[PDB]
Amino acid sequence: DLDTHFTQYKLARPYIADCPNCGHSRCDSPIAIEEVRGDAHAGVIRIQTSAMFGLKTDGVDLAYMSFMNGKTQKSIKIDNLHVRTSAPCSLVSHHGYYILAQCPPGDTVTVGFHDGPNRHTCTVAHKVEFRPVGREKYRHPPEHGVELPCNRYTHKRADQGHYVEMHQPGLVADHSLLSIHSAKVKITVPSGAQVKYYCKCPDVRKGITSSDHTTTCTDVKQCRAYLIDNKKWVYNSGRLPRGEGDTFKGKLHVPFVPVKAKCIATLAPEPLVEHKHRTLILHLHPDHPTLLTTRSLGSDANPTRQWIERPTTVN
Amino acid sequence: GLKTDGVDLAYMSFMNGKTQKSIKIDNLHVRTSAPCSLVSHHGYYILAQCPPGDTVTVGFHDGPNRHTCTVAHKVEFRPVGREKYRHPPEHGVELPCNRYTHKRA
Amino acid sequence: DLDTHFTQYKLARPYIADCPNCGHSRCDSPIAIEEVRGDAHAGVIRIQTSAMF
Amino acid sequence: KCEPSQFQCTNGRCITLLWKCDGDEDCVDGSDEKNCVKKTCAESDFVCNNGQCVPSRWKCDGDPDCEDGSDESPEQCHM
Amino acid sequence: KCEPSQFQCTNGRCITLLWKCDGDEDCVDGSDEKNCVKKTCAESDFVCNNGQCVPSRWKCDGDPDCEDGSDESPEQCHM
Amino acid sequence: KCEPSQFQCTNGRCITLLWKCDGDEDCVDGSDEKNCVKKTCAESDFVCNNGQCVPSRWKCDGDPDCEDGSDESPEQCHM
Amino acid sequence: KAGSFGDLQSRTSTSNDLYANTNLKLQRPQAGIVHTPFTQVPSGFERWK
Amino acid sequence: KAGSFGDLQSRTSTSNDLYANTNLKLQRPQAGIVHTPFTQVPSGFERWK
Amino acid sequence: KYKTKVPSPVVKCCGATQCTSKPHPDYQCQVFSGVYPFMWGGAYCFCDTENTQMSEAYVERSEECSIDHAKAYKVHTGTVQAMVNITYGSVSWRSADV
Ligand SMILES: [Ca+2]
Ligand SMILES: [Ca+2]
Ligand SMILES: [Ca+2]
Ligand SMILES: [Ca+2]
Ligand SMILES: [Ca+2]
Ligand SMILES: [Ca+2]
């Protein structure tokens, strides 16, 4: 069932963190790229974001995602969610904070999704590359060849013993809930949000309220506000401020853990052998850079090793 | 930014034949080797942040028409400093550079 | 005339054949790229598929 | 045609037993997601009218946590 | 202003004579596709209501083959 | 927080004073463009009913140069 | 030599007879799919060019 | 030597005692944004491979 | 291959903060003063030009260490054994390792 995998992820919520090159001027993005993993053997990468995929407030669904604008969590159907590095990658799966994709090599990682006329893009620099399997340096997995042992990120969202922790969110500063009532500033607290305040208009008047609390000073610029929401936890990123007290550790499983399976490698064309007195001549005609290693079966091996890129003849 | 009646930044004007058409900017795209991100546009001029490559294209969808043009122009990434990076980092050392203005003046 | 060049393609049908890398795991698709021909001088190419255009 | 510790759907492809109605249709026809029993809900959670289990802390907080909204109905919470 | 083996449309461009009424608009207005005669059907093909040539093997096959659906009419196929 | 020769938007960001309500929302919420007085129109231009200014030469030329069409109205043009 | 200049020789431009050695070798199909994989050295006319 | 082969040594794959010197140096966050930057030398295991 | 984990940094709005010496592989801790951070929805707080950001970090092994890793061995000379195939007379071949 879906509830087994989405058990602890229902207790969590998205967040807004710092993203460099979100548009052109490094805004605060609803989806923020953290900790790209790209060390498989088929060019398949795993991207962890700050949004939530495969989750809706009402119920779990694989065609609905959850994100945050302001302080309100919004749910939008996944319509155009794209990952591109230098060409548009074909994403495989998504589960909570994580996206799995199959990307061509390049120097950047980009994600984006629309809801209405918005764009919501984040780009984080990261050098991904294609890692072939075997002794031939191909640039794409072939139609046919020889099976070789390879390790790749599986597309199953099971537990598999790997965990990450989630924490209570830190105070979040909202400036939209401070307004002037008639000539004094007023605090609007939505649904028991317990807004903290800090005024230094003639002096310090720090304190915690839960309802109304019209502050007795003039300007909105000389007072700050916060918000302690404790309903849903968040993953402790490095782009979020920590809490005040001691914070418990959660246990959120990493869905797409690395496994070891099978990979397809290219087979080189057969060389043409010519026999001479104590001499072996190989006419090699390769299409990819190929490795040729020889040795002798005597007391000294005398090993040779060279990468063949052009059609050469070796004696 | 011009619609033949006033100033509106979500509108563009072009010519088909001898009639000055004017539509709304729906999908204006500039790509070099990956689709670039636009910054601003004012009159004849567009400003965009592009990856390196050998071609510069720009097109716009009027109705069902495509209306694309391409020119061969080699654009390179130019790092500032004594390290040759291929994309500006999240954190580092601030150094003086020269870029085109964000504003229209 | 347009009907002259379609006097033998009318009698043919598309077919479903396997191809590598549909999405992630190499399905059987109505589109199946065979014999990409790129021996041109301007970068132009001709692609033969299994669908009908 | 595989080991009895493996499962085969109506197409013929053989998958493992751990992929039996786990939520993902592994083979083409998706018959692996058809015939299995529904698990029971926890005692510490609150049961909705449609059966969506929510934690008991989320009951009577002034926010919808269910599709049917039975966790915030006046019948289930005296106001 | 070109060779007699070439054809010139009204704009001024010159195309070859093989590109006259062959199916595609080559220059802007497509004047080569405006004034050209129409050839007959073959003797082995059946002519539908709109004039399309379809083979007689496809006649009364139970499936729509013509544009107007005249290949499966009870008027032209005695039932 | 910054120099009085720099403008501080109400979020907290400080921009320069040459960027004072010049058309672009330079801060996040766009409080820069809200409070500055409107500039006068040119004396050699015809003032439209919507505040726009079009060149006199363009008046009664048979082409609508205004948004509301007040430059080609029969009340404003005597034929 | 199948990869240098004479991997495909025809007596005229439209001759029916054709000499061709290219080290073409058949490969086994894998995992139960219908395709014919082969393996051969690249062309000698491209390598000469 | 933090960059060649022994920059991360553990006795067992399920062990709990780790030795790792990777020249990890924290850096100052700039321009008033909430992030934690650092710098360190590249892994010796990926260099050895 | 290692993986470095960064916890959430603490932000003291106007004051000072210190950190202890936690037992961790390659543990690092610092204090940066006068940052004035800018989150979404305005600045974080009011106490100008003196603050404190901790931003600790520490390293750990990665989740790919269970799949591919290099094992370090020290050798010492041991046994040599072989498998022989033998026959004699009218008795057929029988094999056993020695
Ligand atoms: Ca399943
Ligand atoms: Ca509730
Ligand atoms: Ca034509
Ligand atoms: Ca028929
Ligand atoms: Ca402005
Ligand atoms: Ca006019």
Short mmCIF file of C-alpha atoms in Angstrom, two decimals, chain A:
data_model
loop_
_atom_site.label_atom_id
_atom_site.label_comp_id
_atom_site.label_asym_id
_atom_site.label_seq_id
_atom_site.Cartn_x
_atom_site.Cartn_y
_atom_site.Cartn_z
CA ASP A 1 0.00 0.00 0.00
CA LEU A 2 0.93 3.68 -0.26
CA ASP A 3 0.47 4.39 3.47
CA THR A 4 3.43 2.20 4.48
CA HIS A 5 5.93 4.30 2.49
CA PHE A 6 4.23 7.65 3.18
CA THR A 7 3.84 7.15 6.94
CA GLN A 8 6.46 9.51 8.38
CA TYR A 9 6.43 11.80 5.33
CA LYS A 10 2.85 12.87 6.11
CA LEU A 11 4.10 14.42 9.38
CA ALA A 12 6.56 16.63 7.46
CA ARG A 13 6.02 19.80 5.45
CA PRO A 14 7.94 21.76 2.78
CA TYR A 15 9.95 24.90 3.50
CA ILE A 16 11.52 27.91 1.78
CA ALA A 17 15.32 28.13 1.73
CA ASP A 18 18.05 30.07 -0.06
CA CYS A 19 18.66 29.10 -3.70
CA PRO A 20 21.44 30.68 -5.78
CA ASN A 21 20.44 31.66 -9.34
CA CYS A 22 16.74 31.01 -8.73
CA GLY A 23 15.79 33.54 -11.39
CA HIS A 24 18.67 35.87 -12.10
CA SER A 25 19.19 37.33 -8.61
CA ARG A 26 19.26 34.40 -6.06
CA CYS A 27 15.84 34.76 -4.45
CA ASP A 28 14.25 32.57 -1.76
CA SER A 29 12.81 29.65 -3.66
CA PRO A 30 10.01 27.25 -2.68
CA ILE A 31 12.11 24.46 -4.25
CA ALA A 32 15.78 24.59 -3.26
CA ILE A 33 18.40 22.14 -4.52
CA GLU A 34 20.43 20.43 -1.78
CA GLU A 35 22.91 17.53 -1.97
CA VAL A 36 22.89 16.28 -5.55
CA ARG A 37 24.16 12.69 -5.73
CA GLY A 38 25.59 11.69 -9.09
CA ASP A 39 28.02 8.79 -8.62
CA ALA A 40 26.23 5.91 -10.36
CA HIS A 41 27.33 4.00 -13.47
CA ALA A 42 24.60 5.01 -15.92
CA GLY A 43 24.25 8.79 -15.56
CA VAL A 44 21.30 8.50 -13.15
CA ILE A 45 21.23 11.10 -10.37
CA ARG A 46 19.18 11.71 -7.23
CA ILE A 47 18.19 15.28 -6.30
CA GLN A 48 16.87 16.36 -2.89
CA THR A 49 14.72 19.50 -2.84
CA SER A 50 12.75 21.55 -0.32
CA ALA A 51 9.35 20.88 -1.91
CA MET A 52 7.25 17.75 -1.38
CA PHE A 53 6.35 15.33 -4.18
CA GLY A 54 3.64 12.69 -4.11
CA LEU A 55 1.80 14.28 -1.19
CA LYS A 56 -1.39 16.33 -0.77
CA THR A 57 -2.93 17.69 2.44
CA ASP A 58 -6.13 15.65 1.97
CA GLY A 59 -4.37 12.40 0.97
CA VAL A 60 -1.43 10.70 -0.73
CA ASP A 61 -1.43 10.71 -4.55
CA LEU A 62 1.39 10.25 -7.05
CA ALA A 63 0.12 13.05 -9.33
CA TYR A 64 -0.01 15.81 -6.69
CA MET A 65 2.79 17.82 -5.09
CA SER A 66 2.90 20.14 -2.08
CA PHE A 67 4.85 23.38 -1.67
CA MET A 68 4.74 26.61 0.34
CA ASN A 69 4.19 30.22 -0.66
CA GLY A 70 4.30 32.60 2.29
CA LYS A 71 3.04 30.66 5.31
CA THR A 72 0.32 28.61 3.56
CA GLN A 73 1.04 25.15 2.17
CA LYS A 74 -0.36 24.80 -1.35
CA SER A 75 -1.13 21.67 -3.37
CA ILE A 76 -0.83 21.68 -7.16
CA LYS A 77 -1.07 18.86 -9.71
CA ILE A 78 2.28 17.92 -11.25
CA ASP A 79 1.87 19.31 -14.77
CA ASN A 80 5.34 20.30 -16.03
CA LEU A 81 8.06 19.19 -13.61
CA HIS A 82 11.36 19.18 -15.49
CA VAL A 83 14.99 18.44 -14.66
CA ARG A 84 17.64 19.62 -17.11
CA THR A 85 21.44 19.63 -17.03
CA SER A 86 22.28 20.49 -20.64
CA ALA A 87 19.43 18.56 -22.32
CA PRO A 88 16.03 17.78 -20.73
CA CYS A 89 16.47 14.73 -18.52
CA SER A 90 13.81 12.03 -18.19
CA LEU A 91 12.89 11.80 -14.52
CA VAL A 92 12.13 8.33 -13.15
CA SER A 93 10.39 8.70 -9.79
CA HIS A 94 9.69 11.12 -6.95
CA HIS A 95 8.94 10.45 -3.28
CA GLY A 96 8.71 13.28 -0.76
CA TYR A 97 11.85 15.43 -0.75
CA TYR A 98 13.62 13.48 -3.50
CA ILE A 99 13.58 13.33 -7.31
CA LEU A 100 15.23 10.62 -9.42
CA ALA A 101 16.36 11.48 -12.95
CA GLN A 102 18.50 10.21 -15.83
CA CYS A 103 20.61 13.14 -16.98
CA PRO A 104 23.19 13.79 -19.71
CA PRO A 105 26.56 15.17 -18.55
CA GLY A 106 27.05 18.87 -17.96
CA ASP A 107 27.96 21.52 -15.40
CA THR A 108 24.61 22.63 -13.93
CA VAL A 109 21.53 21.10 -12.35
CA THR A 110 18.11 22.69 -12.85
CA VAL A 111 14.60 22.03 -11.59
CA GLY A 112 11.30 23.81 -12.11
CA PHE A 113 7.51 23.50 -11.90
CA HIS A 114 4.56 25.71 -12.80
CA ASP A 115 1.22 26.17 -11.06
CA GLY A 116 -0.33 29.07 -12.95
CA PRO A 117 1.75 31.63 -14.85
CA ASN A 118 4.65 31.29 -12.38
CA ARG A 119 8.01 29.66 -13.10
CA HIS A 120 9.62 28.61 -9.75
CA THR A 121 13.08 27.64 -10.98
CA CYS A 122 16.28 26.86 -9.06
CA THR A 123 19.72 26.25 -10.55
CA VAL A 124 22.64 24.95 -8.52
CA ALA A 125 26.10 24.46 -9.98
CA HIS A 126 27.27 20.85 -9.93
CA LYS A 127 29.48 18.88 -12.33
CA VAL A 128 27.69 15.69 -13.31
CA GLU A 129 29.23 13.22 -15.74
CA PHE A 130 28.60 9.94 -17.51
CA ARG A 131 30.47 7.02 -15.95
CA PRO A 132 30.70 3.99 -18.28
CA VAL A 133 31.17 0.40 -17.13
CA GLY A 134 34.14 -1.61 -18.35
CA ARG A 135 37.16 -0.84 -20.49
CA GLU A 136 35.34 1.13 -23.22
CA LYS A 137 34.40 4.80 -22.80
CA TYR A 138 30.97 5.00 -24.39
CA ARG A 139 28.76 8.08 -24.10
CA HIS A 140 25.30 6.42 -24.00
CA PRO A 141 24.06 2.95 -22.93
CA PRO A 142 24.01 0.79 -26.07
CA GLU A 143 21.34 -1.42 -27.58
CA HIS A 144 23.47 -4.57 -27.21
CA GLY A 145 26.73 -5.74 -25.69
CA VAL A 146 27.97 -7.62 -22.63
CA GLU A 147 26.39 -7.51 -19.17
CA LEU A 148 28.64 -6.07 -16.47
CA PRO A 149 28.22 -5.59 -12.72
CA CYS A 150 27.08 -2.04 -11.99
CA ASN A 151 25.67 -0.03 -9.11
CA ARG A 152 22.64 2.18 -9.72
CA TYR A 153 20.01 4.01 -7.70
CA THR A 154 16.92 1.79 -7.58
CA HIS A 155 13.47 3.20 -8.34
CA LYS A 156 11.83 1.55 -5.31
CA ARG A 157 10.82 3.71 -2.35
CA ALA A 158 11.37 1.06 0.34
CA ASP A 159 13.17 1.55 3.67
CA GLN A 160 16.39 -0.48 3.10
CA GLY A 161 17.98 0.65 6.38
CA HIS A 162 19.03 4.21 5.44
CA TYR A 163 17.55 7.11 7.39
CA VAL A 164 17.62 10.90 7.65
CA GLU A 165 16.34 12.98 10.55
CA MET A 166 13.75 15.75 10.76
CA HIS A 167 13.56 18.58 13.29
CA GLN A 168 11.20 21.12 14.78
CA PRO A 169 11.29 24.31 12.67
CA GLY A 170 12.95 27.45 13.97
CA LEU A 171 11.27 30.81 14.34
CA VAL A 172 10.10 32.11 10.96
CA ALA A 173 9.94 35.88 10.50
CA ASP A 174 6.81 37.24 8.80
CA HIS A 175 6.43 40.97 8.18
CA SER A 176 2.96 40.73 6.60
CA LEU A 177 1.17 40.22 9.94
CA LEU A 178 2.19 43.62 11.38
CA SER A 179 -0.10 46.50 10.44
CA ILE A 180 -1.20 49.81 11.94
CA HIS A 181 -4.70 49.73 13.44
CA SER A 182 -5.43 53.46 13.75
CA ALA A 183 -2.12 55.04 14.82
CA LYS A 184 -0.48 52.10 16.65
CA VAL A 185 0.82 48.80 15.29
CA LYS A 186 -1.41 45.73 15.62
CA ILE A 187 -0.42 42.05 15.55
CA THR A 188 -2.65 39.63 13.63
CA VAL A 189 -2.18 36.02 14.76
CA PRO A 190 -3.82 33.30 12.63
CA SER A 191 -5.37 30.27 14.36
CA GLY A 192 -3.21 30.19 17.48
CA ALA A 193 0.11 30.77 15.73
CA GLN A 194 1.63 32.31 18.92
CA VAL A 195 3.35 35.31 17.33
CA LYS A 196 6.51 36.46 19.11
CA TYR A 197 7.35 40.16 19.07
CA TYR A 198 10.29 42.45 19.85
CA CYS A 199 9.84 46.23 20.03
CA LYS A 200 12.56 48.78 20.88
CA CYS A 201 10.52 51.90 20.13
CA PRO A 202 11.52 53.65 23.40
CA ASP A 203 12.89 50.45 25.00
CA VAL A 204 12.65 46.66 24.86
CA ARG A 205 9.19 45.14 25.14
CA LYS A 206 9.82 41.49 24.28
CA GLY A 207 7.16 38.85 24.89
CA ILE A 208 4.99 36.06 23.50
CA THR A 209 1.29 36.51 22.74
CA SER A 210 -1.48 34.34 21.34
CA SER A 211 -4.36 36.76 20.63
CA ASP A 212 -4.65 40.39 19.44
CA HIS A 213 -2.05 42.35 21.50
CA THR A 214 -2.19 45.77 19.88
CA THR A 215 1.30 47.14 20.51
CA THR A 216 1.40 50.67 21.94
CA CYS A 217 4.06 52.15 19.63
CA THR A 218 3.96 54.07 16.39
CA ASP A 219 5.99 52.66 13.50
CA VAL A 220 5.99 49.19 11.94
CA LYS A 221 9.71 49.45 11.09
CA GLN A 222 10.90 49.43 14.72
CA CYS A 223 9.41 46.05 15.67
CA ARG A 224 9.98 42.47 14.52
CA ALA A 225 7.74 39.39 14.48
CA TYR A 226 8.10 35.61 14.50
CA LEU A 227 5.88 32.52 14.29
CA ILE A 228 6.04 29.20 16.14
CA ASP A 229 4.33 26.59 14.26
CA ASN A 230 4.72 23.11 15.76
CA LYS A 231 2.19 21.05 13.75
CA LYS A 232 4.63 19.68 11.14
CA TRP A 233 8.37 19.00 11.30
CA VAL A 234 11.04 19.85 8.71
CA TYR A 235 14.33 18.32 7.64
CA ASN A 236 17.20 20.22 9.27
CA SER A 237 18.86 21.91 6.31
CA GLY A 238 21.89 24.16 6.53
CA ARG A 239 19.82 27.05 5.14
CA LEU A 240 17.38 27.21 8.07
CA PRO A 241 17.86 28.64 11.57
CA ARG A 242 17.84 26.15 14.42
CA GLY A 243 15.37 26.04 17.28
CA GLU A 244 15.94 27.31 20.80
CA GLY A 245 15.43 24.24 22.99
CA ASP A 246 16.60 20.68 22.55
CA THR A 247 15.21 19.24 19.33
CA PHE A 248 14.17 15.63 18.83
CA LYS A 249 15.44 13.49 15.97
CA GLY A 250 13.06 12.02 13.42
CA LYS A 251 13.60 9.03 11.15
CA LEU A 252 12.79 9.71 7.50
CA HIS A 253 13.96 6.98 5.14
CA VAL A 254 15.95 7.76 2.00
CA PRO A 255 13.86 6.18 -0.80
CA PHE A 256 16.31 5.65 -3.68
CA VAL A 257 19.27 4.01 -1.98
CA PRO A 258 22.14 2.69 -4.15
CA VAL A 259 22.00 -1.00 -5.08
CA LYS A 260 24.10 -3.22 -7.32
CA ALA A 261 22.51 -4.70 -10.43
CA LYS A 262 23.55 -5.21 -14.07
CA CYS A 263 24.79 -2.79 -16.73
CA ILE A 264 25.22 -3.11 -20.49
CA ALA A 265 28.67 -2.43 -21.96
CA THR A 266 29.79 -2.03 -25.59
CA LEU A 267 31.74 -4.75 -27.39
CA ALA A 268 34.69 -3.62 -29.50
CA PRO A 269 35.03 -4.77 -33.13
CA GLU A 270 37.29 -7.76 -33.65
CA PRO A 271 40.90 -6.98 -34.65
CA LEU A 272 42.62 -8.43 -37.70
CA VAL A 273 45.60 -10.60 -36.75
CA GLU A 274 48.65 -11.17 -38.95
CA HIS A 275 51.38 -13.63 -37.99
CA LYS A 276 55.12 -12.97 -38.41
CA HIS A 277 58.22 -14.72 -37.05
CA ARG A 278 57.85 -14.06 -33.31
CA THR A 279 55.56 -11.12 -34.06
CA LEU A 280 51.82 -10.55 -33.58
CA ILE A 281 50.31 -7.68 -35.57
CA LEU A 282 46.86 -6.39 -34.61
CA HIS A 283 44.90 -4.05 -36.90
CA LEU A 284 42.59 -2.30 -34.44
CA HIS A 285 39.65 -0.26 -35.77
CA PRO A 286 37.76 1.12 -32.74
CA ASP A 287 34.83 3.55 -32.58
CA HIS A 288 35.12 4.48 -28.88
CA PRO A 289 38.30 4.86 -26.77
CA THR A 290 39.27 1.27 -25.98
CA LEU A 291 41.85 -0.27 -23.64
CA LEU A 292 44.44 -2.80 -24.86
CA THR A 293 46.59 -4.48 -22.18
CA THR A 294 49.15 -7.22 -22.86
CA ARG A 295 51.57 -9.27 -20.77
CA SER A 296 54.03 -12.13 -21.18
CA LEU A 297 53.77 -15.56 -19.55
CA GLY A 298 57.45 -15.73 -18.56
CA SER A 299 59.48 -14.72 -15.53
CA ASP A 300 58.93 -11.03 -16.33
CA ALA A 301 55.48 -9.91 -17.47
CA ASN A 302 56.60 -6.64 -19.19
CA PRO A 303 53.09 -5.12 -19.22
CA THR A 304 51.81 -2.62 -21.76
CA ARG A 305 48.69 -0.47 -21.42
CA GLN A 306 47.36 2.11 -23.87
CA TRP A 307 44.02 3.66 -24.83
CA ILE A 308 43.25 3.29 -28.54
CA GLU A 309 41.20 6.11 -30.08
CA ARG A 310 42.36 6.22 -33.72
CA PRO A 311 42.76 3.16 -35.98
CA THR A 312 46.32 2.03 -35.20
CA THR A 313 48.43 -1.08 -35.81
CA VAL A 314 50.49 -2.47 -32.93
CA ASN A 315 53.33 -4.99 -33.18
#
